[PDB]
Amino acid sequence: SELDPKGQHVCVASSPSAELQCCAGWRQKDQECTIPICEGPDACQKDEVCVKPGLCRCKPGFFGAHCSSRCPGQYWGPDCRESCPCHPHGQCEPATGACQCQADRWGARCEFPS
Amino acid sequence: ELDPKHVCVASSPSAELQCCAGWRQKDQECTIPICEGPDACQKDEVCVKPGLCRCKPGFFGAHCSSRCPGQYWGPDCRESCPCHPHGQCEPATGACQCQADRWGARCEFP
């Protein structure tokens, strides 16, 4: 896939080819450069994920000093940084946020019974 | 005023001292991280590392309103409390408050 010049963290090589490349600290996904890079002395430890160039946080759905505590149900994402909108009638997939309703609930936020 | 002890030296010919990128002085050294612009810290967050905000000590979660469980202290619960469950740790410093008739740095003695 090729890079969108209007995409996130896309830069231009100042080499004479002047072709599109990810800006420093980012890697390409599809048409933009939205994968942060954590390498060298800032490489992410076990049970951590890279969230910003050179910055790691506990993996999605976990928090704590060893990234081993499970987020309570009202949160998702790394370090529980995201709010789960279907709590308490469901819980959110830790990495995507997608709602998993309890047994007899439905709706985008699990707001409806039966 | 500035101690050459996160202190850097300017690229200019003045060869004067300055805080290294991302840090500010509060006294004689530069140990205040900088959180600015789009990386400014929200309510109940603190800047801990340049361009990084975390929930204030003893709290975590999307609105930094959940209190850490007892085995942790510090911002976003990043620190381990060595005296849990025989004591509790001060959220910002970690200092143990041992339970009744317990002692030691980690409340390890009955």
Author numbering:
A (entry chain B): 20 to 133
B (entry chain A): 21 to 25, 28 to 132
Task: Provide text from the study.
SCARF1 (scavenger receptor class F member 1, SREC-1 or SR-F1) is a type I transmembrane protein that recognizes multiple endogenous and exogenous ligands such as modified low-density lipoproteins (LDLs) and is important for maintaining homeostasis and immunity. SCARF1 (MW, 86 kD) is a type I transmembrane protein that has a short signal peptide followed by a long extracellular region, a transmembrane helix, and a large cytoplasmic portion. Its ectodomain has three glycosylation sites and contains multiple EGF-like domains, which usually has a two-stranded β-sheet followed by a loop region and three conserved disulfide bonds. Here, we solve the crystal structures of the N-terminal fragments of human SCARF1, which show that SCARF1 forms homodimers and its epidermal growth factor (EGF)-like domains adopt a long-curved conformation.
Among them, two fragments (f1, 20–132aa and f2, 20–221aa) were crystallized and the crystals diffracted to 2.2 Å and 2.6 Å, respectively. The initial phasing for f1 crystal was done by SAD using Pt derivatives and the structure was refined to 2.2 Å with a native dataset after molecular replacement. The crystal of f1 fragment belongs to space group P212121 with two molecules per asymmetric unit. The f1 crystal structure contains a number of loops and two stranded β-sheets stabilized by hydrogen bonds and disulfide bonds, which is consistent with the typical feature of EGF-like domains, and it adopts a bow-like conformation with the middle part (~55–102aa) protruding outward. The electron density of the N-terminal end (~21–62aa) of one molecule in an asymmetric unit is relatively weak and some residues are missing, probably due to the flexibility of this region. In the crystal of f1 fragment, two molecules in an asymmetric unit are related by a twofold non-crystallographic symmetry axis. At the dimeric interfaces of f1 and f2 fragments, hydrogen bonds are formed between S88 and Y94 of the monomers, and F82 and Y94 are also close to each other, thus may form π-π interaction. Two salt bridges are also observed in f1 crystals between two monomers, one is between D61 and K71, the other is between R76 and D98. But the salt bridges are not found in f2 crystals, suggesting they are not required for dimerization. By contrast, mutant Y94A, where the hydrogen bonds and the π-π interactions between Y94 and F82 were both removed, showed a significant elution volume shift and the volume corresponded to the molecular weight of the monomeric SCARF1 ectodomain, suggesting that the π-π interactions between F82 and Y94 were important for dimerization.
